[PDB]
């Protein structure tokens with residue numbers, strides 16, 4: 001298992017514009033297009049992202065390309081973040097993937113907001129971090145995905161994904 005496989009399980013793959021769990025226009029493997037309610041504004045972002053007139057539909061290759069860019073961006077965002085970097089550097093490979101997943105889902109700012117959990121992860125207090133991570137809108141809104149990520153932080157294994 002690796003970060004790509006992990007995120008592919010959590011996000012799924014859809015080749016036509018769809019609405020994410022928050023009601024936002026998305027496509028591919030969890031690629032947010034816009035927070036605007038307009039489908040036209042989403043098709044326009046889509047065409048710009050892909051470099052062609054897509055009419056709201058993309059191919060598997062195009063989906064995978066956006067995905068590669070997005071994972072790369074998440075990692076680079078973590079490495080540039082004064083709050084996230086130190087946590088990422090302190091973790092083992094498996095748990096680093098857990099942190100990337102959260103950043104991919106809610107963005108760098110959002111995760112940097114989990115101040116107390118970040119501190120607990122850095123201190124390697126797995127059980128305690130797991131409890132604190134669950135006290136969040138994230139956990140209440142997407143509980144199955146949150147549990148998978150949280151178990152990954154708790155155990156340092158890919159068990160929730162196998």
Ligand SMILES: [Cl-]
Nearest residue numbers: 048049066069
């Ligand atoms: Cl883009």
Ligand SMILES: [Cl-]
Nearest residue numbers: 142143144145
């Ligand atoms: Cl869920």
